[PDB]
Amino acid sequence: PPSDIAYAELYVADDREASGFLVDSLGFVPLAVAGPATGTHDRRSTVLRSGEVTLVVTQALAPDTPVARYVERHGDSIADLAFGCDDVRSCFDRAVLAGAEALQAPTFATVSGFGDIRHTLVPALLPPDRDWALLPAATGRTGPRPLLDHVAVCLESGTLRSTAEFYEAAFDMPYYSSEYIEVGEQAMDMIFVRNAGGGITFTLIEPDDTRVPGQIDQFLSAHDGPGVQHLAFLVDDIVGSVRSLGDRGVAFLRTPGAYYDLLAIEDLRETNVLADRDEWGYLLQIFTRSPYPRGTLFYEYIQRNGARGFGSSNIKALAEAVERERE
Ligand SMILES: O=C(O)[C@H](O)c1ccccc1
Ligand SMILES: [Co+2]
């Protein structure tokens, strides 16, 4: 089965705006591009990289193409979470066996997943379905950080268990941990799934329909269905990163000073970074505001100092920061 996430592909209405924020604010570097001059007539795509995180930003160049249809439905959104496989044929078979729809058969392959996401399957390197014109930066060595810590996915009520069962069977990503999180009168249920290697961690999040609609329901109506709510990037110095990023225009969600009174500490306070711990050490986390029109996808920065999993105290204070922002 898949060892790692190869890349995430963002479908967008305006790649100037979307890639501009990822490059000029977050610091991603363009590596390669595809478009009419490389034989890809219906869209322009750009591969961006930072450390080991690869994002592909893709914009339709004609109305009523699949990309254009996707973006009209969902807004700017992740449409593809690509898996790197030691043996693609084997990954594809195991996935179809588990009930994954065959969206394109091994010509590299594409299977379905939660909501209308795609999972392109690729050798564990740029996407294999299009031909790429390289930038000079593509020919140079990349840092080991940042790396993609986990992907958070919003699911419709009553689909959490069967989504998790699918990911266990299709991709060998079994249960890792679960949390039930309450904010005000709303709540959400989540399961973290993770493969044996630890290369792939998803947060599967469903809203609790026995409580009052909240931020997960809002995500689902804005995005118009299940989708990726956030990508989290693992960094060595989240305080430093949040300082430089803040300088390049990045808006992070704020936490009240109250939280810091309870809880180095002056550094976290200043940066609105959240701290929690597991049996093996601490983790620091922060969310950015969504930079997209519908207020859906956003980014997370995480630093692990020994922590292997996730802390229920950070999850709650993150979800509180999103609600303060939502209002
Ligand atoms: O970062 C995490 O622990 C996790 O993906 C998460 C999901 C939903 C709200 C807050 C946090
Ligand atoms: Co997260």
Pocket test for ligand 1, best of 318, 322, 326 (most atoms within 8 A of CB): 318
| Nearest residue to 29 via CA among 12, 46, 17 | 46
Q: Name 136's Cβ contacts closer than 8 Å, sequence gap at least 6.
A: none
- Please tell me the number of the ligand nearest to residue 179's CA: 1
Q: How far is the CA of 192 from the centre of ligand 2 (A)?
A: 10
Q: Name 6's Cβ contacts closer than 8 Å, sequence gap at least 6.
A: 54, 82, 83, 84, 120, 122, 124, 125, 127
Superfamily of domain 1-144: 2,3-Dihydroxybiphenyl 1,2-Dioxygenase, domain 1 (3.10.180.10)
Say how far apart CA 120 and CA 122 lie, in whole Å.
6
Contact 265, 255 (CB under 8 A): no
Q: What share of the chain is helix, strand, coil (3-state, %, to 5)?
A: 30, 35, 35
Contact 81, 127 (CB under 8 A): no
| Nearest residue to 56 via CA among 88, 94, 18 | 18
Binding residues are 150, 230, 285, 300
Pocket test for ligand 1, best of 149, 216, 300, 315 (most atoms within 8 A of CB): 315
Say how far apart CA 71 and CA 47 lie, in whole Å.
19
Tally Cβ neighbours within 10 Å of residue 322. Answer: 21
Say how far apart CA 119 and CA 302 lie, in whole Å.
25
> Peptide bond before 213: cis, by omega within 30 degrees of 0?
no
- CB burial of residue 308 (10 Å; 0-12, 13-18, 19+): middle
What is the CA angle 273-146-244, rounded to 5? 50
Q: Which two structure tokens, joined as six digits, stand for 257?
A: 């000073």
> Ligand 1, closest atom to CA 300?
1
Contact 181, 87 (CB under 8 A): no
DSSP SS3 for 183: strand
Tally Cβ neighbours within 10 Å of residue 145. Answer: 16
Q: How far is CA 325 from CA 20, 139, 155, 272, in A?
A: 23, 40, 21, 13
Tally Cβ neighbours within 10 Å of residue 95. Answer: 27
What is the CA angle 174-179-184, rounded to 5? 150
- Please tell me the number of the ligand nearest to residue 204's CA: 1
Q: How far is CA 92 from CA 162, 181, 215, in A?
A: 20, 35, 34
Q: Do domains 1-144 and 145-327 have the same CATH topology?
A: yes
DSSP SS3 for 256: coil
Residue with tokens 């399957």: 121
DSSP SS3 for 194: strand
Q: This structure's resolution (angstroms)?
A: 2.0
- CB burial of residue 128 (10 Å; 0-12, 13-18, 19+): middle
Residue with tokens 């909240």: 214
| Nearest residue to 209 via CA among 162, 156, 163 | 156
| Nearest residue to 82 via CA among 44, 51, 46, 109 | 109
> Ligand 1, closest atom to CA 287?
1
Pocket test for ligand 1, best of 201, 205, 231 (most atoms within 8 A of CB): 205
Say how far apart CA 19 and CA 37 lie, in whole Å.
20
Q: Which residues have CB under 6 Å of ligand 1?
A: 150, 152, 190, 203, 205, 232, 285, 300, 310, 315, 318-319
Q: Which two structure tokens, joined as six digits, stand for 90?
A: 């084997």
Q: How far is the CA of 272 from the centre of ligand 2 (A)?
A: 16
List 50's β-bridge partners, or say none: 53
Say how far apart CA 260 and CA 263 lie, in whole Å.
5
> Which residue minimizes the CA distance to atom 2 of ligand 1?
315
H-run or E-run covering 280? none
Q: How far is the CA of 152 from the centre of ligand 1 (A)?
A: 7
Say how far apart CA 76 and CA 11 lie, in whole Å.
6
Domain residue ranges in the chain: 1-144, 145-327
Q: Residue 322: phi, psi to the nearest 5?
A: -65, -40
Q: How far is the CA of 3 from the centre of ligand 1 (A)?
A: 22
| Nearest residue to 27 via CA among 153, 137, 139 | 137
Residue with tokens 């601490």: 282
> Which residue minimizes the CA distance to atom 10 of ligand 1?
315
- CB burial of residue 97 (10 Å; 0-12, 13-18, 19+): exposed
To the question of domain 145-327 being in CATH 3.10.180.10, the answer is yes
- Please tell me the number of the ligand nearest to residue 299's CA: 2
Q: Which two structure tokens, joined as six digits, stand for 66?
A: 């699949």
Q: Residue 45: phi, psi to the nearest 5?
A: -125, 145
Say how far apart CA 242 and CA 301 lie, in whole Å.
8
